[PDB]
Amino acid sequence: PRPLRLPDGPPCSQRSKFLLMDALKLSIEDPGIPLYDAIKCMRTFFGWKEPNVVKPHEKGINPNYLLSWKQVLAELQDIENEEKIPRTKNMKKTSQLKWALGEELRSLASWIQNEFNKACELTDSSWIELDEIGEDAAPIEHIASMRRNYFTAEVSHCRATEYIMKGVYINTALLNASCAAMDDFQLIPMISKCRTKEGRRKTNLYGFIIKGRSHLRNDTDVVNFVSMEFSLTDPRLEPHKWEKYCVLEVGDMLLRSAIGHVSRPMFLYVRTNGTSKIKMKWGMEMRRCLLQSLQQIESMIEAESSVKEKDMTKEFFENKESPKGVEEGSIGKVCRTLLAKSVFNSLYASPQLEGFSAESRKLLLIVQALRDNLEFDLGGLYEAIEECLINDPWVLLNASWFNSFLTH
Numbered sequence: 001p002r003p004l005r006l007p008d009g010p011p012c013s014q015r016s017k018f019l020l021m022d023a024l025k026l027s028i029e030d031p032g033i034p035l036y037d038a039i040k041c042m043r044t045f046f047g048w049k050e051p052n053v054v055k056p057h058e059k060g061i062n063p064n065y066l067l068s069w070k071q072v073l074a075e076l077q078d079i080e081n082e083e084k085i086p087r088t089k090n091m092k093k094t095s096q097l098k099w100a101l102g103e104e105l106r107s108l109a110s111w112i113q114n115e116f117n118k119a120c121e122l123t124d125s126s127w128i129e130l131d132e133i134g135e136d137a138a139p140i141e142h143i144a145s146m147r148r149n150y151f152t153a154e155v156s157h158c159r160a161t162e163y164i165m166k167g168v169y170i171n172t173a174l175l176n177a178s179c180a181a182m183d184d185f186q187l188i189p190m191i192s193k194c195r196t197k198e199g200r201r202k203t204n205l206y207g208f209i210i211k212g213r214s215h216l217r218n219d220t221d222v223v224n225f226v227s228m229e230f231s232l233t234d235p236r237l238e239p240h241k242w243e244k245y246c247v248l249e250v251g252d253m254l255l256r257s258a259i260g261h262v263s264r265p266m267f268l269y270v271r272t273n274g275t276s277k278i279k280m281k282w283g284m285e286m287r288r289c290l291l292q293s294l295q296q297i298e299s300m301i302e303a304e305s306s307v308k309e310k311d312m313t314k315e316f317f318e319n320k321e322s323p324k325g326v327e328e329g330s331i332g333k334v335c336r337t338l339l340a341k342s343v344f345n346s347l348y349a350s351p352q353l354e355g356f357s358a359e360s361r362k363l364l365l366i367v368q369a370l371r372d373n374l375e376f377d378l379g380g381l382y383e384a385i386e387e388c389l390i391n392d393p394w395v396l397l398n399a400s401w402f403n404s405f406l407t408h
């Protein structure tokens with residue numbers, strides 16, 4: 001039993017629907033209309049400057065990406081002058097937008113492991129309410145509630161939880177617009193809401209998307225969109241990550257940092273993309289990632305409870321023939337690690353991931369049984385696994401992880 005052969009080639013590139021570790025938020029402290037919130041977030045920033053391309057899209061029409069962003073600013077400037085901010089803004093159907101809206105092996109790069117690491121971290125803000133998890137009709141039993149409270153306290157601030165609510169919000173807004181403005185190039189703010197450690201509600205703007213025409217007769221029909229996302233990441237440090245994007249420099253931002261106050265350039269990551277009804281419906285269900293990882297944690301708690309003939313919830317979560325430690329260093333880190341895996345499975349869903357998960361599972365049980373009991377042939381299963389290792393960053397990372405497991 002050898003390691004999986006990972007593919008040779010240029011490094012894999014980002015393919016998520018929105019930025020993850022590289023996102024940047026413009027934020028207001030709240031006292032519910034997306035466009036109004038977006039404009040108020042825009043107003044908090046004074047470092048805008050004339051935009052230019054700093055990392056061109058190698059296959060796209062870069063002037064059109066630039067034109068599209070300048071059109072967003074100009075049309076928000078229009079809204080500023082009208083007396084009442086409208087509920088929604090439909091973009092002029094300009095040549096640049098008509099183009100942008102449509103009217104090979106890759107090797108493992110280090111950035112996806114870094115994304116996963118960032119997804120497991122805690123943030124300074126809470127992204128869910130105390131009763132966010134579950135959809136029970138009846139009141140829950142005392143133990144079930146205890147497990148939920150413990151788990152929630154461990155993941156409410158997790159970056160992966162921000163990715164969930166960000167994903168829920170933008171898929172809801174796009175699925176709604178695809179239906180409520182079928183023929184419009186509607187401008188759609190990318191928003192999230194969170195609560196600071198001190199209890200203050202804040203509203204965040206990540207950027208914008210503009211949807212194309214969306215006559216979605218069935219679940220697989222595709223609506224195209226153009227995404228425009230703030231970032232402080234200079235794309236020239238890892239240009240292979242940004243193969244699908246045109247990247248603009250659009251401002252300069254004053255920051256507090258470990259070296260004192262600094263001025264940093266602000267970037268806008270622009271790409272054309274698409275999604276479908278069925279993917280948007282799954283996007284709206286990403287809170288189930290919280291439920292799934294809770295259930296893995298509970299699994300787990302039961303195993304310990306069955307052996308000790310006593311419920312082990314408190315002992316498990318408070319870390320009080322029994323386990324002497326936690327490999328990740330804390331129970332919190334186990335919860336956030338399981339959540340991040342579930343969230344990345346959703347952010348990077350693919351058929352290659354489905355086959356890899358099902359096929360690598362069979363090889364794992366086989367290798368375990370062999371390791372356990374030693375001091376019909378595997379070639380067919382290895383080809384089944386390795387046929388999924390093409391170019392997808394998340395699948396390749398999981399293959400790399402799988403190979404460490406084979407080694408030890």
Ligand SMILES: OCc1cccc(Cl)c1Cl
Pocket residue numbers: 039042043048072073074076077080
């Ligand atoms: O307030 C939104 C907006 C529209 C047009 C130009 C600029 Cl610089 C801004 Cl902040």
